[PDB]
């Protein structure tokens, strides 16, 4: 056995100890972190709460992030123009350019797409000279119904401005570049010594098996609905009762075996407009026995007694109820002492005393 | 508008043509053929190496063609590359999001690619001169999650996704070339032939489709399952197709016979299938269960040649090395155990 590769082995042991240090710091910072899941029915409620908690950032604060969106804007530029030419090639009409040399420029730019370097003036000249044909805009009209990012022409005229070096563009290019929906958006913020991580759902599926089983490890669940949904139209048929499938969601989560010992937090976003329609319209649609009493104040109480007693004979967990508040500062208090209390419960059950 | 029903009657006529043809190929008894061979006997395997270091579950595992390096993906947000001969780490890779449902490794050994719920598959270069691991590309364009994705060649890769479609990708242009449609249910798994010309796609519609790469046309449909399909594995010559299912049953199909051959189950086996893998010989069948027990099946004689156990939590991943000397397993127990 050679000494030098043996020293490479022990060197792999100490570099493996460095890897173990990364696993230690990552595992401790994961293990101290407070995780909470976000669900909801209405888009306006979830968007109202998450934009309500949103603290304003600057898009261009860092030059490293500036390099990031240089790569992303270059990606949308080159990806856009190659999508335009292959979109033309997918047409059954014979649509070629008048100038034949521009086709050599187009094959050269299909070669030029692969390099990892920076953008040169010649490729920008190719895409601008090809872009000056109005039939490419006619192909934007045809390809409007196909797979394409709809802001694309702005990227090319913008790149006509971007051709000069040492540019810095403003915020709306960055924010417009992150105008997309799919994927789960993670948020990280701090309130009173606790670090929160929220995981929403893009609403990508009606059916939940695999990704719903992978959300097993979680401290608490936030479920938001609009109680006003009995007067709200969510229907493709005569039956417009959103609360039926909403209670199907709540019962579906509560009756799932994976989430047997985890609590639920529950919010009601809209109340004022709700009160005015209480005067305008009686809640007779759901149940008559629900609408035993005319008076507006206790009309909420039935909703929390229904959603509260939809639990299936389990008393290790309890559904916390809350109401809409003018200021976000009151909202995070309920989350704060709620998760503090359930952590205290978990530690008490861990110590064996309770 | 009633013509769709008319062609549904003609379609049903082609279906009774299918049952008559499959009866004509169902004249013969397989039990005689399986009866004409000698049994193998009891097999005992022992765990020679175990692996550590993960603080979370194991959702992916994939082999290299050199039969040295193993890659394992956890959901705490890290990839680590293993050496199986000496139990040494090679590289440790952090990624943007902790959601990882699949992994892969290059046949050439140069690339590694992962992905998950964030709709973005990332391919990583390992032989870069700077001494780290860099994000080369981020491929996007799907609307759902991607369940499994694997390299056929170094220039073009295949993914399966949650929008019920499949897609062929090109790395250098970062744009999809060919897309495959025709499923009504979610695509759950993927496997490709060793000849690399044909890959089959399982789904949750209790069906399986045989897809071609160059021509883009589904040629044969295999149906007759009662539940979802989780794992797929190919026979080494490419002439036999095996399927896993949810109800603790497994079936084998043939492309040239166009009929199911043998269904594997037992009265005491009620837990579903999580992974399926063959051996080089094709005589043996490995399968993972939900009740912590991996039964080793005889493919021809349909009897259990042995039972292996020793994990505490549910097994997720199963595979064999290319040279045939070892079987690796992974579980939710956060430890890996290899059988020899």
């Amino acid at each position: 056995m050679g000494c030098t590769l043996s020293a490479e082995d022990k060197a792999a042991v100490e570099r493996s100890k460095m890897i173990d240090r990364n696993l230690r710091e990552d595992g401790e910072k994961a293990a101290r972190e407070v995780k909470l899941l976000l669900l909801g029915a209405g888009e306006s409620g979830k968007s109202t709460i998450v934009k309500q908690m949103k603290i304003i950032h600057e898009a261009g604060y860092s030059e490293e992030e500036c390099k990031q969106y240089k790569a992303v804007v270059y990606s949308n530029t080159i990806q856009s123009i190659i999508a335009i030419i292959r979109a033309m090639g997918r047409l059954k009409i014979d649509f070629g350019d008048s100038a034949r040399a521009d086709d050599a420029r187009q094959l050269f730019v299909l070669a030029g797409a692969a390099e990892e370097g920076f953008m040169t003036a010649e490729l920008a000249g190719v895409i601008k000279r090809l872009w000056k044909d109005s039939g490419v805009q006619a192909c934007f009209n045809r390809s409007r119904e196909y797979q394409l990012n709809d802001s694309a022409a702005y990227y090319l005229n913008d790149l006509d401005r971007i051709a000069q070096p040492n540019y810095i563009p403003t915020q709306q290019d960055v924010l417009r570049t992150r105008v997309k929906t799919t994927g789960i958006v993670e948020t990280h913020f701090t309130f009173k010594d606790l670090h929160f991580k929220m995981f929403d759902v893009g609403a990508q599926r009606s059916e939940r098996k695999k990704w719903i089983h992978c959300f097993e490890g979680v401290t608490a669940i936030i479920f938001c609905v609009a109680l006003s949904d009995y007067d709200l139209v969510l229907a493709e048929d005569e039956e417009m009762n959103r609360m039926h499938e909403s209670m199907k969601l709540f019962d579906s989560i509560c009756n799932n075996k994976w989430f047997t010992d985890t609590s639920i937090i529950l919010f009601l976003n809209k109340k004022d407009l709700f009160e005015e329609k209480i005067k305008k319209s009686p809640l007779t649609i759901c149940y008559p026995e629900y609408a035993g009493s005319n008076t507006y104040e206790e009309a909420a109480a039935y909703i929390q007694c229904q959603f509260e007693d939809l639990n299936k004979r389990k008393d290790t967990k309890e559904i916390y109820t809350h109401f809409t508040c003018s200021t976000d500062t009151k909202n995070v208090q309920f989350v704060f002492d709620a998760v503090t209390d359930v952590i205290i419960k978990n530690n008490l059950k861990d110590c064996g005393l309770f | 508008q009633s013509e769709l029903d008319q062609l549904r009657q003609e379609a049903e006529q082609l279906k009774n043509q299918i049952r008559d043809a499959r009866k004509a190929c169902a004249d013969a008894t397989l039990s005689q053929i399986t009866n004409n061979i000698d049994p193998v006997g009891r097999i005992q395997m022992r765990t020679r190496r175990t692996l550590r270091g993960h603080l979370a579950k194991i959702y992916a595992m994939h082999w290299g063609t050199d039969s040295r390096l193993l890659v394992s993906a956890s959901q705490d947000g890290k990839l680590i590359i293993w050496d199986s001969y000496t139990t040494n780490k090679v590289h440790a890779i952090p990624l943007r999001s902790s959601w990882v449902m699949t992994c892969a490794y290059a046949p050439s050994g140069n690339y590694v690619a992962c992905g998950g719920l964030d709709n973005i598959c990332s391919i990583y270069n390992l032989k870069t001169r700077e001494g780290n691991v860099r994000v080369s590309r981020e491929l996007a364009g799907h609307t759902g999650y991607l369940s499994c994705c694997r390299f056929l060649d170094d220039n073009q890769i295949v993914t399966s996704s949650g929008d019920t479609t499949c897609a062929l990708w090109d790395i250098e242009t970062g744009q999809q070339t060919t897309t495959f449609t025709g499923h009504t249910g979610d695509v759950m798994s993927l496997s490709l032939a060793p000849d690399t010309r044909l890959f089959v796609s399982g789904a949750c519609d209790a069906s399986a489709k045989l897809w071609d790469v160059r021509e883009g046309m589904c040629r044969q449909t295999f149906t007759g399952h009662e539940s979802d399909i989780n794992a797929i594995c190919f026979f080494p010559n490419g002439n036999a197709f095996a399927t896993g299912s949810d109800d603790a049953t497994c079936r084998l199909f043939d492309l040239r016979a166009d009929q199911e051959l043998m269904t594997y189950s037992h009265d005491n086996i009620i837990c579903g299938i999580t992974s399926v893998s063959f051996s080089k010989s094709g005589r043996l069948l490995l399968a993972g269960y939900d009740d912590f027990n991996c039964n080793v099946w005889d493919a021809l004689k349909a009897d259990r040649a042995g039972v292996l156990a020793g994990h505490d939590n549910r097994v997720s991943c199963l595979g064999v090395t290319d040279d045939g000397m070892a079987v690796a397993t992974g579980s939710w127990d956060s430890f890996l155990k290899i059988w020899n």
Partner: antibody
Amino acid sequence: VQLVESGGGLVQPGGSLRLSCAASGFNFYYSSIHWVRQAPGKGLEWVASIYSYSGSTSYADSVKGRFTISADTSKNTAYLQMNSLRAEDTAVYYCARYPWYWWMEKPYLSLYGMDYWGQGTLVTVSS
Amino acid sequence: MTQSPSSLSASVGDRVTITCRASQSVSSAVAWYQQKPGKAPKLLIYSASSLYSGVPSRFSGSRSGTDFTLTISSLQPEDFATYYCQQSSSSLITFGQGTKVEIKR
């Protein structure tokens, strides 16, 4: 498909002959035809090419200013006219086919290589 | 611009590595041809990685920067000929100087 050369022969200095390669069964409008020089004892040099879809063509630097080329896409026959031959121009000429654009025919994977090769023939310059 | 290949000889079943290094930055437009005397050039690999249809699993390849490496494992007795490195990234087309493979006696 088959690529068949024609028009070759053994040549004297000061003469001129017309080189030709026949296209068989493939679309000639969508491809390019390439001619290379195989020197005796040495490797391969590339000299001339015919591009059908754009019309412009490229020549080797040592040879440009002497040769001219034309082609007829309707008869599936491409021609090369060689003039001002010198004694060093003895070489074997291969007919070769490279596809520049692969998408306008049908949707196919990107390619970079010579698909089909002719059998070649000897042309010499000797007094 | 030009490129500088290399040449080596080996025995039966020996791995051989052929390296074709470029002068400037070139995209993945590279092909390898086999030329034995009495035969036309045969295309083996296109775009420097992907194999042609009909070629067995013995051949491989890679791309790193402008360095390209050809790998032939499990060598056959019939495979002895020149191998050419090809560039196709600009309208100008450059061919290589070529290698050779001989059997060790």
